[PDB]
Structure 1
Amino acid sequence: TKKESFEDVLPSILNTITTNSELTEVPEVANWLKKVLEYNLAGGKKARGLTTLFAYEMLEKPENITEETIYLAKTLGWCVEILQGFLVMLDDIMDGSTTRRGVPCWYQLPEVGLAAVNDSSLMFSSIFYVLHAHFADKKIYTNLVELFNESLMHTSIGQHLDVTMQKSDYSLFTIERYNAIVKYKTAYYTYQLPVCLGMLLANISDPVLHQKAEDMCLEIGKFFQIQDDYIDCYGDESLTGKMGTDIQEAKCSWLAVMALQRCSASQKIVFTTCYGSKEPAHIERIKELYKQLQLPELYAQEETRMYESLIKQAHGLPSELSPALFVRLIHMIYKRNH
């Protein structure tokens, strides 16, 4: 498949990183970074990486594709996956997670701890070395750099809106707020960024076509993140790799937004009493409540209603952008369970 052609290049990227920086003079560190990247890139569906590649392939004229440019698309893809490793390494710190992708969270390991913040800084550094190494003499260098940087700003905005903190006043848990959280923290780097890289590599220029792409990208990313929210509560931990914590940490997830939309007055009491606590009596009661408000069934309807809506918006796009591309991206996620 396409996944095995993408995982092939990992050791080569690991090597590019070392050889193209001051890590060569300090191999104690160049070896520590190899262990960090291998652990924090392992497991995982590699979806953002693939998306970048698939996008290049689907968008470039097949006669202009070279083996060189395919390698570059895999490299860009891997930058995005490093980005992802960086973000979830910090995210697990802010969310007091204990596992991810089947194993303990990087910071949980005993030899690491809060030293993880610096491992993240190493990872995020790597990306610009790789970019610099391949791309310094090409006209698109600036655009690539700018894009990875925007994607950090957006992701940081989102993360702030999410982790921003009164006990039992759940009146910021609105749909207006959830839509902003999920635009900035997930949509931009998960879909806008891969596709936009695919577009740059394919030398697509039109600022009107970028906009049309952004609009569709962000719709899909909201979709994606509503599924993630569902999975936190209802996913199977062996399949998903992670223990679900949105309830205990009192996050504004889609499920809580929807619970509040549906609650009677007494149920709202139950919710503002038991949501956000780590006691397991309290977490069971909140899942019993999600069960009565019939949210697993709403989810199913909404997954399908958005699915149809996206497919329809995808078929509305100019062909220079490839409807097929978006259709497939949507199918990759539709009905997923991890």
Structure 2
Amino acid sequence: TKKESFEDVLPSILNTITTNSELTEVPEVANWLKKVLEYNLAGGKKARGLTTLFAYEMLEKPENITEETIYLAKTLGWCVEILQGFLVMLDDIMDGSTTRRGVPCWYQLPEVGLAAVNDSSLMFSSIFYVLHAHFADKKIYTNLVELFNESLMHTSIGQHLDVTMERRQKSDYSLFTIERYNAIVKYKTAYYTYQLPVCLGMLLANISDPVLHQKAEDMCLEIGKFFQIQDDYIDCYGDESLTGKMGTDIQEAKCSWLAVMALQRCSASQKIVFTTCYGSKEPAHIERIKELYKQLQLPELYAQEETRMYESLIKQAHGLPSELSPALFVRLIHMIYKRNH
């Protein structure tokens, strides 16, 4: 399977990180970073790294694909996985999270705490040593480095929208609109989750035409909105033993798809219940919100919107130039439709 094949290269990636940096001189640190990386990359689906490799394989002419290019595609994919692990290490701090991939969040470990913020920088900086080690002498080098820095800017833009204390004042949820939601998810998720791995695949396949990149980017951004709606749903409704994480969107007062849809449907008296109980860690409050979501039929709306968006994404995919592989995108869509984690 593609997953074990992708995972097979991880130990070699970790050595590359060391050997190509000053880490060679400070083994206390090189050994620590190994622990950081193994913990924060462990488990999960590897979906972003896979999407990188799948894109490359689907977009390149099969006659131009070599074992070396496959290793390079996996390497780019692992760089997205590292970015992911960095992003979620900080996100977990910001979101008051307790567990991820079925264990304590990195920052919750007693030996780590707030020094996680330095572990994050060590992870992020690893990326550029991988990129330099494999690509410095190639024409795509500066496209790669810029793409990963752009991804950091995009994601942080979206994270600011997400966590900003200005998103709500007390009982004022006037900013919980779809305009705000669309901005949040476009920036915090859609870019790094889809646009980045696909663009990386494209660059590796020597596709440079700005029109094709723009077309692929618009497709990606649509898929990533869809993907975050599913993330938000799962926060509320997912099975912890499958997702590996306790949901916190309700207690943290997030402008999640569910909150936005709930406000679409609240009666005047329901709106008061929402504003009273949303954003609180008391279990009775949290439960009251979930009951309200149920009364408002948000589970049925999700199922129907997931399908409508699904059908819309598939049609968009079929209308892409063949140079972008409609089939790749159809398959990416198919892989996440109906997911429960």
Same fold (TM over 0.5): yes
Q: Deviations over 1:127-160 (max 9, x none)?
A: 0000000000011100000000000000000000
CA distance in 1, matches of 2:150, 2:96: 26
RMSD (Å) for aligned C-alpha atoms: 0.4
CA deviation digits over 1:179-232, x for unaligned, max 9?
Answer: 000000000000000000000000001100000101100000000000000000
Q: How many Å separate the matches in 1 of 2:330 and 2:157?
A: 29
* Cα deviation code 1:268-321 (max 9, x no counterpart): 000000000000000000000000000000000000000000000000000000
Quote the Cα distance in structure 2 between the aligned partners of 1:102 and 1:160: 27
1:58-112 alpha-carbon deviations (Å, 9 max, x no partner): 0000000011110000000000000000000000000010000010000000000
What residue in structure 2 maps to residue 200 of structure 1? 203
Q: Which runs of 5+ in 1 are unaligned?
A: none
1:23 to partner: Cα distance: 0.4
1:38-76 CA distance string (max 9 Å, x none): 000001100000000000000000000011110000000
CA distance in 2 between counterparts of 1:93 and 1:175 reads 26
C-alpha distance in 2 between matches for 1:129 and 1:273: 49
Find the aligned partners of 1:200 and 1:74 in 2 and give their Cα distance: 14
**Aligned pairs, how many?**
338
Tell me the distance in 1 between the aligned counterparts of 2:247 and 2:30: 34
The alignment-based identity, stated in percent, is 100
Match of 1:235 in 2: 238
1:289: which partner in 2? 292
CA distance in 2, matches of 1:95, 1:326: 31
For residues 305 and 140 of structure 1, the distance between their equivalents in structure 2, rounded to whole angstroms, comes to 38
Q: Deviation above 4 Å: which 4+ runs of structure 1?
A: none
Q: Distance in 2 between matches of 1:269 and 1:226?
A: 25
Aligned pairs for 1:146-295 (under 5 A) are: 146-165=146-165, 166-295=169-298
| Partner in structure 2 of residue 120 of structure 1 | 120
Question: Structure 1 CA distance, aligned partners of 2:62 and 2:217?
Answer: 24
Q: State the alpha-carbon separation in 1 of the partners of residues 173 and 123 from structure 2.
A: 36
TM-score (norm 1): 1.00
| Unmatched segments (≥5 aa) in structure 2 | none
